């Protein structure tokens, strides 16, 4: 945790539906964008911090 | 018409416990109709919750919040009030006062005014 991993994410086609959909991922938190818009608005990086 | 609507109340609480809030409104308007408040759930579409007549006579809430929040009004200072038990999970949103510029209520769909936004958070 205190060493985080970033990723970057960008020039491709962001699946947030493939995420969307897995049971383990209990834990779904989103704040600013509505879970269901996420592949309608179009941001130039994603940041994963893992 | 111009009318203004000031919003006080919200913030953190435990679940099952008690809050504040209060609308109070200024300006001028067509008449003397109804006052209610919205919900919006984070995620979710804007949903009503209540609606007062301004004289206090006939009063309407929600079949999911019935017997658990009401609405009252004051006698001296024109700010309506409301009161809430029992919270759970769910009843962490964003709350507005909105007036309706009608005598007599048939719908929610038409919403004159809104005001500010009032976050409220219920969790342990």
């Known amino acids: 945790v205190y060493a985080w991993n970033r990723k970057r994410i960008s020039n491709c086609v962001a699946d947030y539906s493939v995420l969307y959909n897995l049971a383990p991922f209990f834990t779904f938190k989103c704040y600013g964008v509505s879970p269901t818009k996420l592949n309608d608005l179009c941001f130039t990086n994603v940041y994963a911090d893992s | 018409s111009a009318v203004q609507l000031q919003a006080s109340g919200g913030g953190f609480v435990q679940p099952g416990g008690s809050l504040r809030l209060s609308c109070a409104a200024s300006?001028?308007?067509?008449?003397?109709?109804?006052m209610g408040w919205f919900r919006q759930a984070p995620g979710k579409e804007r949903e009503f919750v209540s609606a007062i007549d301004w004289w206090d006579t006939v009063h309407y809430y929600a079949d999911s919040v019935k017997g658990r929040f009401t609405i009252s009004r004051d006698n001296s200072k024109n700010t309506v009030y409301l009161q809430m038990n029992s919270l759970r999970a769910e009843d962490t949103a964003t709350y507005y006062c909105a007036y309706w510029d009608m005598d007599y209520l048939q719908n929610s769909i038409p919403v004159d005014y809104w005001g500010q936004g009032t976050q409220v958070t219920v969790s342990s």
């Open positions: 300006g001028w308007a067509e008449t003397f109709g109804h």
